[PDB]
Amino acid sequence: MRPALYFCGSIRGGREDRTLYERIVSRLRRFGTVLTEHVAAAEAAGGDRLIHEQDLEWLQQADVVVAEVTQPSLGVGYELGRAVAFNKRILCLFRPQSGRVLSAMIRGAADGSRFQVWDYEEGEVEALLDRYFEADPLEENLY
Amino acid sequence: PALYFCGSIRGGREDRTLYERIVSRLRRFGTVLTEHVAAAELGARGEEAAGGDRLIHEQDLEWLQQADVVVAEVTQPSLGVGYELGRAVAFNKRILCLFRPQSGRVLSAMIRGAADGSRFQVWDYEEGEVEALLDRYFE
Numbered sequence: 001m002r003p004a005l006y007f008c009g010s011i012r013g014g015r016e017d018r019t020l021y022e023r024i025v026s027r028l029r030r031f032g033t034v035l036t037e038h039v040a041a042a043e044a045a046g047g048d049r050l051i052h053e054q055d056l057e058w059l060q061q062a063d064v065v066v067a068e069v070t071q072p073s074l075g076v077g078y079e080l081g082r083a084v085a086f087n088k089r090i091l092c093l094f095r096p097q098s099g100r101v102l103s104a105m106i107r108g109a110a111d112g113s114r115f116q117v118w119d120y121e122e123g124e125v126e127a128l129l130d131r132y133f134e135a136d137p138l139e140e141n142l143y
Numbered sequence: 144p145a146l147y148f149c150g151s152i153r154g155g156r157e158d159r160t161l162y163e164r165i166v167s168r169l170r171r172f173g174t175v176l177t178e179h180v181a182a183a184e185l186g187a188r189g190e191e192a193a194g195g196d197r198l199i200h201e202q203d204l205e206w207l208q209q210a211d212v213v214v215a216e217v218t219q220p221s222l223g224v225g226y227e228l229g230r231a232v233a234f235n236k237r238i239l240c241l242f243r244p245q246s247g248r249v250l251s252a253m254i255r256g257a258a259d260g261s262r263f264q265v266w267d268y269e270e271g272e273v274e275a276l277l278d279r280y281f282e
């Protein structure tokens with residue numbers, strides 16, 4: 001089976017955050033299955049405990065975790081803490097345009113290898129995801 | 144015990160009196176590892192952390208590992224608070240989250256859903272009763 005990618009963004013993302021999440025998930029599918037694609041596409045049905053166990057099972061199964069961290073979210077932050085504890089390969093994408101500052105706990109978790117945080121402008125997100133996987137692919141290129 | 148108070152930078156800036164009240168009541172029960180962060184200079188809107196991001200990340204991580212209990216104010220959405228609760232669950236810490244539903248917020252399913260009702264508890268409260276609730280938990 002293809003690689004498993006985990007995409008993580010704020011469930012309270014606004015209209016603009018939502019179009020960016022759809023762009024990121026759509027591009028990630030070129031690299032494998034996006035486990036959270038239906039959640040990104042949508043009492044929460046199934047209830048909070050079920051949701052927590054499902055995202056934990058998907059985080060643990062992931063080959064890579066890609067989080068959009070522009071909007072503050074306890075959920076995105078919690079999933080990044082569980083992902084670092086699972087020693088996963090993590091990429092955070094943050095848009096500095098709003099002038100809001102990314103939490104020091106996320107910027108400060110970066111080690112430039114396994115945990116990376118990249119500032120980006122909305123227009124270049126597809127090109128930056130291609131760059132990230134071209135530098136360290138999940139599947140080897142054909143000859 | 145060594146107690147870890149976890150709250151957000153936005154929460155600390157807007158709800159300073161509440162954060163001071165929670166930290167003050169926790170001192171009755173033990174040492175509060177984040178006592179010099181919670182109601183200290185938290186900078187202003189748009190400002191980067193004065194102390195350096197990696198320094199901050201490593202210091203909070205060191206205090207989290209040493210803590211006997213993590214008490215988090217989860218009313219304000221924060222990637223930092225969420226991240227610290229994720230690291231603390233992976234460290235098998237006893238965790239109490241305090242949420243204020245009068246704010247109008249809906250607490251993330253990932254925090255409400257992490258509750259196991261004993262080791263990780265989430266309590267909805269109104270600001271006026273926080274001292275009585277911390278007394279209840281520690282007694």
Ligand SMILES: COc1cccc(-c2cc(C(=O)O)ccc2Nc2nc(N[C@H]3CCN(c4cccnn4)C3)c3ccccc3n2)c1
Nearest residue numbers: 007008009010011036039040044051054073075250251252
């Ligand atoms: C936008 O792209 C994503 C992608 C991955 C994770 C998340 C996510 C974010 C948050 C967060 O930001 O706090 C919380 C839970 C998340 N995960 C999730 N959320 C499911 N349902 C949602 C319907 C509304 N909702 C709410 C509403 C208010 C409060 N908390 N949760 C949760 C869900 C259903 C079935 C199976 C697995 C699920 N997993 C978001």
Ligand SMILES: COc1cccc(-c2cc(C(=O)O)ccc2Nc2nc(N[C@H]3CCN(c4cccnn4)C3)c3ccccc3n2)c1
Nearest residue numbers: 102103104149150151152155177181185192194202221223
């Ligand atoms: C309010 O009560 C608390 C209690 C415990 C943790 C936290 C906290 C929250 C967040 C978060 O919500 O994202 C991030 C880091 C935190 N921890 C921390 N923050 C220090 N300084 C602050 C000055 C403003 N600041 C900023 C400003 C913009 C962006 N990110 N961080 C970080 C700090 C200094 C020295 C030693 C240890 C430190 N540790 C807050």
Ligand SMILES: [Cl-]
Nearest residue numbers: 192193194195
């Ligand atoms: Cl600081």
Ligand SMILES: [Mg+2]
Nearest residue numbers: 001002003004
């Ligand atoms: Mg595989």
